[PDB]
Amino acid sequence: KPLKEVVGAYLALSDAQRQLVAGEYDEAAANCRRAMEISHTMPPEEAFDHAGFDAFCHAGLAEALAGLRSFDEALHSADKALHYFNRRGELNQDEGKLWISAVYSRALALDGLGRGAEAMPEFKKVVEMIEERKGETPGKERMMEVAIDRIAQLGA
């Protein structure tokens, strides 16, 4: 019973992560929600990092929803991930890649909702974090180009 749920949740999240890379955002969003649903069926006495795991799921979910241009839901998912990363996040660990992702998703969501005044500083934050982070950050070129193009278009 207990480990079945731990592995079930981990595999659901891994599937979602591969789907994000492949651009299958509909499936990725479903698997992120499914991963959390499974993680929350565990008894409280079983050792598991719920706070961190939920943050990872929300980051992935925010990226998927941003991809589908469902910005309102994306914004809320990114905020739930950032609530964790701002408190217990570590930028120079693998975890940091998902932190940056959540900040980027938030910027895209705010921009998609027509809240450019708030999106701008978030796009700047994405670039600042990429610089600050020691270690490979896959997709950094894509993010930085979007960030810089939007900061210019919103300013004009």
Backbone as CSV, one residue per row, in Angstrom:
resi,resn,N_x,N_y,N_z,CA_x,CA_y,CA_z,C_x,C_y,C_z
1,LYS,0.801,-1.260,0.000,0.000,0.000,0.000,0.833,1.311,0.000
2,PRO,1.709,1.545,1.014,2.464,2.831,1.066,3.408,3.153,-0.100
3,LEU,4.347,2.260,-0.398,5.272,2.483,-1.518,4.620,2.497,-2.891
4,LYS,3.480,1.832,-3.033,2.757,1.816,-4.300,2.399,3.256,-4.698
5,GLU,2.031,4.060,-3.701,1.640,5.449,-3.899,2.842,6.360,-4.144
6,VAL,3.958,6.087,-3.471,5.188,6.863,-3.664,5.685,6.699,-5.093
7,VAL,5.773,5.453,-5.547,6.233,5.165,-6.905,5.211,5.655,-7.931
8,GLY,3.925,5.473,-7.647,2.867,5.934,-8.543,2.952,7.426,-8.820
9,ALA,3.179,8.203,-7.763,3.293,9.657,-7.866,4.555,10.064,-8.618
10,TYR,5.681,9.432,-8.291,6.947,9.703,-8.986,6.862,9.416,-10.485
11,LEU,6.265,8.289,-10.863,6.135,7.942,-12.279,5.173,8.876,-13.012
12,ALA,4.124,9.326,-12.328,3.182,10.264,-12.922,3.893,11.581,-13.235
13,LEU,4.725,12.053,-12.301,5.468,13.298,-12.497,6.539,13.143,-13.577
14,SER,7.244,12.011,-13.613,8.250,11.790,-14.650,7.600,11.797,-16.028
15,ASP,6.434,11.156,-16.151,5.694,11.138,-17.415,5.346,12.566,-17.833
16,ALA,4.857,13.357,-16.882,4.501,14.752,-17.140,5.695,15.550,-17.639
17,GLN,6.848,15.350,-17.013,8.071,16.054,-17.404,8.519,15.727,-18.830
18,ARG,8.396,14.469,-19.251,8.738,14.091,-20.624,7.732,14.705,-21.597
19,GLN,6.471,14.749,-21.181,5.406,15.319,-21.998,5.576,16.834,-22.200
20,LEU,6.072,17.544,-21.186,6.336,18.981,-21.318,7.386,19.205,-22.396
21,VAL,8.460,18.423,-22.356,9.522,18.511,-23.361,8.976,18.245,-24.764
22,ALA,8.056,17.290,-24.874,7.454,16.920,-26.157,6.341,17.857,-26.628
23,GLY,5.934,18.806,-25.795,4.873,19.733,-26.150,3.465,19.181,-25.989
24,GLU,3.331,18.057,-25.288,2.029,17.463,-25.011,1.519,18.063,-23.706
25,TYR,1.132,19.333,-23.761,0.737,20.068,-22.560,-0.553,19.585,-21.898
26,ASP,-1.530,19.163,-22.697,-2.786,18.626,-22.166,-2.516,17.415,-21.272
27,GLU,-1.690,16.496,-21.764,-1.355,15.274,-21.022,-0.493,15.588,-19.809
28,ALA,0.448,16.509,-19.981,1.342,16.908,-18.907,0.578,17.510,-17.731
29,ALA,-0.393,18.365,-18.033,-1.201,18.991,-16.995,-1.970,17.930,-16.223
30,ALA,-2.578,16.993,-16.947,-3.334,15.908,-16.329,-2.454,15.048,-15.417
31,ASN,-1.255,14.705,-15.884,-0.324,13.901,-15.079,0.221,14.616,-13.841
32,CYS,0.393,15.935,-13.909,0.821,16.706,-12.739,-0.251,16.691,-11.663
33,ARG,-1.501,16.903,-12.064,-2.612,16.868,-11.126,-2.756,15.457,-10.562
34,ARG,-2.600,14.453,-11.424,-2.709,13.058,-11.000,-1.612,12.702,-9.995
35,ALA,-0.406,13.214,-10.220,0.718,12.965,-9.320,0.437,13.491,-7.912
36,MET,-0.161,14.679,-7.818,-0.520,15.251,-6.519,-1.666,14.502,-5.863
37,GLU,-2.669,14.133,-6.656,-3.806,13.377,-6.150,-3.324,12.096,-5.469
38,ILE,-2.363,11.419,-6.093,-1.786,10.194,-5.546,-0.957,10.475,-4.297
39,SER,-0.132,11.516,-4.344,0.724,11.856,-3.207,-0.080,12.179,-1.949
40,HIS,-1.261,12.769,-2.122,-2.115,13.111,-0.981,-3.004,11.969,-0.465
41,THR,-2.870,10.766,-1.026,-3.609,9.596,-0.536,-2.760,8.786,0.442
42,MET,-1.528,9.231,0.688,-0.635,8.547,1.613,-1.026,8.847,3.046
43,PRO,-0.736,7.914,3.970,-1.007,8.224,5.371,0.006,9.278,5.829
44,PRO,-0.343,10.093,6.840,0.594,11.131,7.289,1.897,10.584,7.889
45,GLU,1.842,9.393,8.489,3.017,8.771,9.112,4.058,8.176,8.136
46,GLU,3.833,8.260,6.824,4.797,7.743,5.848,5.709,8.888,5.392
47,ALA,7.021,8.689,5.522,8.017,9.710,5.176,7.987,10.058,3.694
48,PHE,7.755,11.335,3.404,7.664,11.831,2.036,7.709,13.357,2.090
49,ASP,8.410,13.980,1.146,8.514,15.439,1.107,7.336,16.024,0.319
50,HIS,6.186,16.161,0.980,4.979,16.696,0.337,5.127,18.129,-0.155
51,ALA,5.747,18.983,0.651,5.931,20.384,0.287,6.737,20.524,-1.006
52,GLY,7.876,19.837,-1.055,8.744,19.852,-2.228,8.119,19.185,-3.436
53,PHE,7.502,18.027,-3.228,6.873,17.302,-4.317,5.730,18.103,-4.938
54,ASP,4.886,18.705,-4.104,3.787,19.537,-4.604,4.321,20.756,-5.376
55,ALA,5.440,21.315,-4.919,6.061,22.444,-5.608,6.510,22.059,-7.014
56,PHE,7.104,20.879,-7.138,7.586,20.377,-8.419,6.401,20.159,-9.359
57,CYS,5.317,19.592,-8.833,4.107,19.359,-9.619,3.485,20.671,-10.094
58,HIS,3.410,21.656,-9.199,2.865,22.975,-9.550,3.714,23.719,-10.591
59,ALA,5.033,23.558,-10.529,5.920,24.179,-11.505,5.636,23.588,-12.877
60,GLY,5.601,22.259,-12.937,5.302,21.547,-14.172,3.923,21.902,-14.700
61,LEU,2.944,21.966,-13.803,1.573,22.299,-14.182,1.491,23.710,-14.759
62,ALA,2.206,24.645,-14.144,2.225,26.034,-14.606,2.803,26.136,-16.014
63,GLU,3.873,25.390,-16.275,4.488,25.374,-17.603,3.515,24.832,-18.649
64,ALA,2.808,23.757,-18.307,1.845,23.147,-19.225,0.686,24.093,-19.528
65,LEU,0.126,24.692,-18.482,-0.991,25.617,-18.630,-0.599,26.871,-19.413
66,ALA,0.641,27.322,-19.233,1.154,28.466,-19.978,1.220,28.095,-21.453
67,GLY,1.675,26.872,-21.725,1.758,26.344,-23.084,0.402,26.286,-23.771
68,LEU,-0.637,25.948,-23.008,-2.000,25.890,-23.532,-2.673,27.266,-23.579
69,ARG,-1.987,28.291,-23.073,-2.495,29.665,-23.007,-3.705,29.792,-22.071
70,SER,-3.722,28.949,-21.037,-4.725,28.985,-19.978,-4.019,29.734,-18.858
71,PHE,-3.878,31.036,-19.052,-3.056,31.866,-18.172,-3.539,32.074,-16.742
72,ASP,-4.848,32.134,-16.531,-5.358,32.337,-15.182,-4.969,31.153,-14.290
73,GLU,-5.226,29.935,-14.760,-4.866,28.733,-14.005,-3.353,28.586,-13.872
74,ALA,-2.622,28.986,-14.909,-1.159,28.922,-14.900,-0.577,29.813,-13.809
75,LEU,-1.092,31.035,-13.715,-0.639,31.991,-12.717,-0.799,31.440,-11.308
76,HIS,-1.960,30.854,-11.027,-2.226,30.298,-9.700,-1.339,29.103,-9.367
77,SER,-1.048,28.271,-10.359,-0.182,27.129,-10.136,1.252,27.599,-9.883
78,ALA,1.718,28.575,-10.661,3.062,29.118,-10.475,3.214,29.764,-9.092
79,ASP,2.199,30.501,-8.642,2.241,31.125,-7.317,2.370,30.090,-6.204
80,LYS,1.673,28.962,-6.336,1.763,27.896,-5.335,3.168,27.285,-5.307
81,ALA,3.816,27.188,-6.463,5.186,26.678,-6.521,6.164,27.683,-5.915
82,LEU,5.982,28.956,-6.250,6.850,30.018,-5.754,6.719,30.248,-4.249
83,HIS,5.548,29.957,-3.683,5.343,30.080,-2.237,6.338,29.172,-1.510
84,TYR,6.618,28.009,-2.098,7.593,27.067,-1.550,9.033,27.489,-1.852
85,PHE,9.322,27.794,-3.116,10.688,28.152,-3.517,11.232,29.417,-2.848
86,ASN,10.379,30.406,-2.604,10.834,31.622,-1.937,11.201,31.353,-0.475
87,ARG,10.568,30.352,0.137,10.844,29.989,1.527,11.990,28.981,1.666
88,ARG,11.869,27.822,1.013,12.861,26.733,1.144,13.626,26.369,-0.136
89,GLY,13.626,27.245,-1.136,14.291,26.941,-2.406,15.797,27.140,-2.404
90,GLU,16.488,26.307,-3.184,17.945,26.372,-3.352,18.260,26.472,-4.851
91,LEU,18.688,27.662,-5.269,18.937,27.963,-6.680,20.021,27.115,-7.350
92,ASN,21.076,26.766,-6.619,22.181,25.989,-7.198,22.047,24.463,-7.138
93,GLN,20.845,23.953,-6.888,20.607,22.506,-6.904,19.670,22.244,-8.058
94,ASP,19.463,20.980,-8.428,18.564,20.665,-9.555,17.216,21.363,-9.409
95,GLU,16.745,21.417,-8.167,15.541,22.137,-7.750,15.444,23.536,-8.395
96,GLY,16.579,24.233,-8.475,16.663,25.577,-9.054,16.136,25.719,-10.470
97,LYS,16.244,24.655,-11.263,15.723,24.663,-12.631,14.201,24.817,-12.628
98,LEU,13.537,24.165,-11.678,12.086,24.286,-11.545,11.684,25.641,-10.945
99,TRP,12.542,26.225,-10.108,12.279,27.544,-9.531,12.217,28.542,-10.691
100,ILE,13.268,28.547,-11.514,13.365,29.441,-12.667,12.170,29.245,-13.598
101,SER,11.801,27.989,-13.824,10.649,27.652,-14.654,9.365,28.307,-14.138
102,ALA,9.140,28.224,-12.830,7.948,28.801,-12.210,7.896,30.322,-12.348
103,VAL,9.048,30.972,-12.219,9.137,32.427,-12.356,8.836,32.812,-13.807
104,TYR,9.356,32.023,-14.745,9.132,32.242,-16.166,7.663,32.044,-16.513
105,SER,7.060,30.974,-16.001,5.633,30.719,-16.210,4.785,31.880,-15.685
106,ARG,5.158,32.410,-14.521,4.440,33.525,-13.928,4.515,34.754,-14.819
107,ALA,5.694,35.010,-15.381,5.878,36.143,-16.281,4.999,35.990,-17.523
108,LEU,5.014,34.798,-18.126,4.191,34.516,-19.305,2.704,34.641,-18.998
109,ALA,2.298,34.186,-17.816,0.899,34.243,-17.408,0.435,35.682,-17.215
110,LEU,1.217,36.466,-16.478,0.899,37.872,-16.252,0.816,38.623,-17.572
111,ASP,1.741,38.316,-18.477,1.783,38.950,-19.787,0.541,38.559,-20.597
112,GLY,0.196,37.273,-20.562,-0.985,36.763,-21.257,-2.304,37.336,-20.752
113,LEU,-2.337,37.730,-19.481,-3.522,38.334,-18.872,-3.572,39.854,-19.061
114,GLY,-2.599,40.418,-19.776,-2.556,41.860,-20.027,-2.006,42.682,-18.875
115,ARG,-1.324,42.026,-17.940,-0.730,42.683,-16.778,0.771,42.824,-17.023
116,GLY,1.108,43.605,-18.047,2.497,43.826,-18.456,3.375,44.549,-17.448
117,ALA,2.786,45.471,-16.687,3.520,46.209,-15.659,4.120,45.269,-14.612
118,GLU,3.423,44.171,-14.323,3.885,43.183,-13.355,4.736,42.101,-14.007
119,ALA,4.486,41.834,-15.290,5.222,40.817,-16.038,6.667,41.221,-16.287
120,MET,6.882,42.504,-16.572,8.231,43.010,-16.846,9.269,42.685,-15.775
121,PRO,9.039,43.121,-14.523,10.013,42.762,-13.490,10.236,41.252,-13.329
122,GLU,9.225,40.425,-13.611,9.394,38.966,-13.537,10.300,38.454,-14.647
123,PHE,10.171,39.012,-15.855,11.069,38.636,-16.959,12.512,39.023,-16.637
124,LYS,12.698,40.172,-15.987,14.027,40.608,-15.560,14.578,39.618,-14.528
125,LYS,13.716,39.167,-13.613,14.095,38.219,-12.560,14.554,36.884,-13.149
126,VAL,13.923,36.453,-14.243,14.308,35.210,-14.910,15.752,35.317,-15.394
127,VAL,16.083,36.430,-16.041,17.435,36.643,-16.551,18.437,36.713,-15.400
128,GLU,18.087,37.439,-14.339,18.964,37.571,-13.172,19.263,36.220,-12.514
129,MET,18.249,35.368,-12.401,18.428,34.042,-11.798,19.295,33.120,-12.647
130,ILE,19.149,33.207,-13.965,19.962,32.408,-14.882,21.439,32.794,-14.736
131,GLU,21.713,34.091,-14.611,23.083,34.559,-14.405,23.624,34.048,-13.080
132,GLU,22.830,34.252,-12.032,23.194,33.891,-10.667,23.458,32.399,-10.495
133,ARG,22.657,31.572,-11.154,22.785,30.129,-11.025,24.082,29.578,-11.621
134,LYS,24.867,28.907,-10.778,26.060,28.196,-11.223,25.492,26.828,-11.596
135,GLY,25.731,26.391,-12.831,25.221,25.100,-13.301,24.357,25.219,-14.544
136,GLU,24.331,24.146,-15.330,23.572,24.092,-16.578,22.083,24.363,-16.348
137,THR,21.499,25.225,-17.182,20.076,25.547,-17.113,19.472,25.350,-18.504
138,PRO,19.063,24.106,-18.833,18.482,23.808,-20.144,17.342,24.741,-20.498
139,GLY,17.317,25.176,-21.754,16.286,26.084,-22.249,16.498,27.542,-21.881
140,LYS,17.672,27.875,-21.341,17.967,29.251,-20.929,17.951,30.239,-22.085
141,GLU,18.374,29.798,-23.264,18.427,30.685,-24.426,17.011,31.063,-24.854
142,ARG,16.116,30.078,-24.878,14.718,30.305,-25.227,14.084,31.324,-24.297
143,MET,14.258,31.117,-22.993,13.690,31.994,-21.973,14.238,33.420,-22.022
144,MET,15.555,33.551,-22.123,16.174,34.871,-22.175,15.743,35.677,-23.385
145,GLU,15.604,35.022,-24.536,15.175,35.724,-25.745,13.734,36.219,-25.613
146,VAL,12.855,35.380,-25.078,11.477,35.786,-24.854,11.454,36.958,-23.872
147,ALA,12.202,36.825,-22.782,12.271,37.853,-21.755,12.700,39.203,-22.303
148,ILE,13.764,39.213,-23.094,14.297,40.461,-23.621,13.385,41.070,-24.694
149,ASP,12.767,40.233,-25.526,11.860,40.733,-26.560,10.606,41.344,-25.949
150,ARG,10.050,40.693,-24.927,8.858,41.195,-24.245,9.136,42.476,-23.444
151,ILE,10.259,42.518,-22.726,10.631,43.723,-21.980,10.689,44.923,-22.939
152,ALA,11.137,44.720,-24.176,11.199,45.814,-25.160,9.820,46.179,-25.728
153,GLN,9.025,45.166,-26.068,7.684,45.378,-26.634,6.715,46.007,-25.633
154,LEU,6.784,45.584,-24.370,5.955,46.164,-23.305,6.372,47.608,-23.018
155,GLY,7.675,47.887,-23.108,8.211,49.238,-22.905,7.841,50.208,-24.020
156,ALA,7.502,49.665,-25.195,7.076,50.448,-26.361,5.593,50.201,-26.633
